[PDB]
Amino acid sequence: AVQQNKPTRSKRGMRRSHDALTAVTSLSVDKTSGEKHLRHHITADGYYRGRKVIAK
Amino acid sequence: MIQEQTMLNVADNSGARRVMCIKVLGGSHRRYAGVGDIIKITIKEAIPRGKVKKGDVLKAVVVRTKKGVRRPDGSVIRFDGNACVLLNNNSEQPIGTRIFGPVTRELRSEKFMKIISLAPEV
Amino acid sequence: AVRITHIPTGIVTQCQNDRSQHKNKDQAMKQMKAKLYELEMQKKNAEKQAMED
Amino acid sequence: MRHRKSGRQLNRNSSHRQAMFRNMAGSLVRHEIIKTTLPKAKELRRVVEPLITLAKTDSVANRRLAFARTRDNEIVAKLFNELGPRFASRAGGYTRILKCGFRAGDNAPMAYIELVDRSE
RNA sequence: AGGACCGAACCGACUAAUGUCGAAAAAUUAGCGGAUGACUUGUGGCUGGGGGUGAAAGGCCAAUCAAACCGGGAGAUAGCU
RNA sequence: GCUCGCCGGAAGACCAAGGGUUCCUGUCCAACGUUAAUCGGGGCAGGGUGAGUCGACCCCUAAGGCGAGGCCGAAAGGCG
RNA sequence: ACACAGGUGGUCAGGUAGAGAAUACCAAGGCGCUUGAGAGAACUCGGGUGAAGGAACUAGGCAAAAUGGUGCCGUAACUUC
RNA sequence: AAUUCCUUGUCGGGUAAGUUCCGACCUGCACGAAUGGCGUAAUGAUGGCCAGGCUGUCUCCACCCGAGACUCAGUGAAAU
RNA sequence: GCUCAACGGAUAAAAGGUACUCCGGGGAUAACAGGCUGAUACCGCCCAAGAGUUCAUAUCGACGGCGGUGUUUGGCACCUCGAUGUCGGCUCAUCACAUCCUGGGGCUGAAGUAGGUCCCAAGGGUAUGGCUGUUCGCCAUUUAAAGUGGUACGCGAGCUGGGUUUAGAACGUCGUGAGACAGUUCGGUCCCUAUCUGCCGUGGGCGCUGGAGAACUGAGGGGGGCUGCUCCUAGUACGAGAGGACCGGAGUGGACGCAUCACUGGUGUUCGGGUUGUCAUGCCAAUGGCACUGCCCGGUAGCUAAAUGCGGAAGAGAUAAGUGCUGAAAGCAUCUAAGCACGAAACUUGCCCCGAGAUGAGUUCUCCCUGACCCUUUAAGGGUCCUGAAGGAACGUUGAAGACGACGACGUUGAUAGGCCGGGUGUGUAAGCGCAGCGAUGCGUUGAGCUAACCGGUACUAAUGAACCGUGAGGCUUAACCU
C-alpha cells in the first residue's frame, strides 16, 4: 500500500545505481563524406556505405 | 464423457427411457464414465407396464456416448446418442432382453457377454 | 449451544434455553431425561390400552 | 506465447491494420521512396512484394485482383505499366530498407523504404 | 374512450460489472419502468429554520439535515485529553 | 494536397439564457495547453457589431409585489 | 475549481430499406476525441468461439446464453366475463 | 402463518437425498373481525418454490481479438 | 414540627426511551482474538468386585484416586477503545500424532475368512451432492479412507456479503407511551498504484590474487513417496458343511504430477467461401468499406485439453514396535549388560531437478600475452609514448528464446530474416468468354482460381571492412627439486 518509514537518501543512491545511461561508442565513419554516422544508419546528408542513397 | 446430472436414453426393453446418472463407480473422485463402465443411475421416465418405475435407483452400464471411443489404431467411433443398458444393481446382470441400436466391441468382458449377443450390430 | 442425542432412542435436544454451556448441558440432560420420562408413559399407555381390550 | 507466430499487431485492430497498410502501399509506388517507422517498414515488405509479384505478369484477372487489393486505379496504372516491366528480370526482393535517424518527437526509430530500381 | 398494451424522444433509476487519490465531491456500459397522464418541462412568482414543505423517510430547504448558513453573545462551559 | 475512418433526429446548422472580445488579421513562444508547437479560446498591437419592418424599450394585463388615505400592531412593521 | 466521458430550453432535420424522429449505411455539414513509438508475459477490464454433460457452482439460474418480426390456423384452468 | 419458542412439529406430494415450498391435523408459547377477518380474476423492475428450454455459471478451463500492464522518448502526482 | 427515598441530609418540590445519534475520555471497564489458570471438557495411568458359559487381566468396568495437553465453556482484566474492523463459503495451504486408510507386529473365546484391541510410524493420500446463513448436523450415492486438532475458532492491504450488529417496513408478545425482544420477516456502498521483511522468477557489479573459452566432480537443497481390481500360484493350506488364505508372480484401471501435438477435437478477428442491408468505382458485372469478424460455414502453423506417452521403484546400509541364538548377573531359566543376525510407505541413499558466492570460491582440457625513459613510499607502484592480443561487447538480421535483461543461430568464408520458385495444406469449379433458358441460373473451359505462420532450394533485399573494451609473463615465505 504505502511506505512505513522514510528510506534514506543513501538507499535512493543505490536504487539509481543501475539507472546510469550508457554511451554508444559505435560511431562509424562514412567513406566518401567521412561524416560520423551510426553503425547501419545513413549519414546526415544521406550517404551510406559510399553511396548517395537518400537522393536529397 | 458421461457424468452425474446427465440424461441418457436406455437401449433395452426394461421399461425406462429417460434416465439420469447420479454417480460414476470405479475408483474415488472419478469424473467420467467411458463407454465401457458402470454407473449408478435413477429413472425419470418409464413406460406404464414396465419392469421398473419412475424414481428407482439401480446400476447401469453405458454402451453409447456422443464422445465416442478411440481404438488402438487411432480411429474413433462416435455416436449421436448417450445410450445405456440397465443392470440389476446387486447381481449386475441386464434386466432387459432386447437391446436397441448398435453397440461397440469394447463390451468384450464377461459381465456383458449376454449384452453383445442381443445387440443388432457390432 | 449444546445438542445431546439419545442414540438408542434417537431423541435429540438442542438446549438453547440458558446462556452458559454447562447450564444448557444439564438442562439438556434435564430435557432428554424429560423426553424419556414421557415416552415411557406412552408405551405404558400402550400397556394400559390392551388391558382394556 | 507467440511461438512461431508471424506478423505484427502494431497497436491496431486488424480492420484498421489492413486498411492502414493498404493506403501505405499505394503511397510507396507513387513516390518510389518514403520515410516511416522501422517496424512498419519491416512489415510493409510483406504487403507490396506480392503485388509486385502479381505485377510481374499481366492478366485481366490479375489487374482486377490488383484492384481488389489496394483499391486504386491510378496506382494500378503505376503497376503493370512501369513496375511490372521494369521488374521483369528482378526475382524477389524489390524493396530496400535504410534506417534513418530517430523521429524528433517520440524518438521513434525512423527508416527509409525504397524500391531497388529507382534509376535516379 | 381508456390513470389501456408494445415502444423511441423525455422523465425515472430495478440488476450486474467498472470506478473508489475515478472521466465524475453518484457517473459510464449493457439490459430495464412509465411514456394521453396522479405525465413531463421552460419562464416568472409565494412559503423559511423549531419554521417552511412533505403520495410521510423524518425526506428536502444552494453538494452541508433529528435540525441550513452568516455574524454576534463568546476567549460560552469543560471534574476530561 | 491525395487516400482512410467516425457522427449523421448527431459529434450538423440557427435563436433564447448566460458569459463578456473568447470573433478577424499581423506578430511573438518564457508562462498556460497534462508532450513538442513554426498551432491555439495563450502574450502584444490594430480592426470588427450599421435596422421604421428582427428583439427589447413602449401600449395592455396574469400569478404576484408595492401601495395615497384607511385598518391593525410596544416600536420596527403587517394586511389591503 | 480544470481545455472535466455529466447537465442545458426552443427551431429546421434529406436518400435507400424500414411501421418509425428505432436501427443500419450515406448527404448537407462537422470531425479523428491533444501525448506517442514498439513488445504482444502473468494478471485486470471490454468481447468472440468452444468438443461431452447442461445448474452438478451458488445464499439464489446473479451474469450470460436464448427467445424475438409479419400473416394464417389454434389457444386451458380461472374470472368481476 | 410475514404470527409456532421447544420444532427441521407430526403425517401425504415433490427428490436418489428437501431445516425452504405445496396440501392436512390442532397442542393457537403469543390469530381473530374496520388495531378489520377470510377469499379474489387481473396487475407488479416484488417474497419463496419446482419443470421445460438454453447456455462456460460449473466439472476444467482452452485459444483468440482489442485497451492497459512491460520497454523507449516527453511532462510529471498522492495517501504515508 | 411536615423534614431529609440513598439516614454528613446536591433546597424538606422530581420518572423513562434513543440502533441518526452527537461531543469529550477509557483497554482505568465489557464482546472477537492473544495471555496466566486448568474448575469444566479431552486424553492417559492405579486399586479392583462384578458382567461376561466356566475364568475380571479376552474386553468393559462400578467404588475412589493420581497426572498431562491447552482444541469446549468458563475464571481474572495483563495488551489494543487518537480501531486488533467481521461468522460461514471460495482459493491456497502448512504443522503436530492421540492414525481414517495403505505398511510392519503382539494377543485372542484369532478354526478358515472376516473383525475386535494394543504398540511402532507423518511417507503419501485423506469424496460428490440434497437441505440450512452455516460450522455442526441429517439423508443419498460412493470410496482403499471420506481422520482428530493447531495455525488471530489459518486465510477478506486475495474474493463474496448469504448471516449479522446502521438508516425503511410489517407480524406476534410486553409496555399508558416512546420503544424494547429467549424473537422472525422482505431490502440493504466491502477503500488502498506495495517503501521494507518474506516468497516465486530473472538480471547487472564485483570477487575467485594472470586473462579468456567450454566440459564436469560435488557439499548442500528441492521435487518425488497413494492405491484399487482381476487372474495365476491353488478353488491348494485350513474347514464337519458353508466358505475361503499369508508369501510370491503377471496384467489392467482410478486419482495426481511431468512432457509432447503423430492421432480425436477446441481455438484459429493475418486463409478460402456463401450471404442480408447499404455507400462508392458513370452504369451492369466484378470487387472493396461498414454494421460485435455484420451474421455464419470450414480451416494451416502455433497454443491447448477432454487427446497421447511416462513416473511412483526394485534394491542396499543403519533402526522402531517386534523376533531369535549363545549366555550372564542369580549353578537353573533369560533377546542382554559383552557379542551377533533379521526387522516398515518411516531414517540415509537409490530416481529426477538446481547446484563451486560451497569467500572451503574446487577439478580437467585448450588458447593468448615475455616494449621503452623518468618519478621514486625504491613501491605487488605511477606518468607518457610504441603496442592493445585470446576473447568479449556493441551494432545489425532474428528464434518453437523472451516482460525488460539474459540465453541461442548467423553476419556474405552466408541461408538469420523477408521475398521469389516449387511442393504441401485449406477453401470448393475464380474472373472472362461461349451455349441453353422468358428469368433466377445451369453447363464446358476447371479440383481450377486464390492460398497466413509448414518443408526444400535461390543471396533478389537487408545483416559493411574496422572501430570500442580487455594487455605487454602474474607478490612474499617454506619445503622439495636444478648449477
From Swiss-Prot, chain D:
- In terms of domain of life, where is this protein from? Bacteria
Q: Which family does it belong to?
A: Belongs to the bacterial ribosomal protein bL17 family.
One Pfam annotation reads Ribosomal_L17
Q: How does it assemble?
A: Part of the 50S ribosomal subunit. Contacts protein L32.
User: What are this entry's molecular-function GO terms?
Assistant: structural constituent of ribosome
The GO cellular component terms are:
cytosolic large ribosomal subunit
Organism encoding this protein: Escherichia coli O81 (strain ED1a)
Q: What is this protein called?
A: Large ribosomal subunit protein bL17
Which Gene3D superfamilies does its entry note? Ribosomal protein L17
Q: Which GO terms describe its biological process?
A: translation
Keyword Ribonucleoprotein set for record: yes
Keywords of the record: Ribonucleoprotein, Ribosomal protein
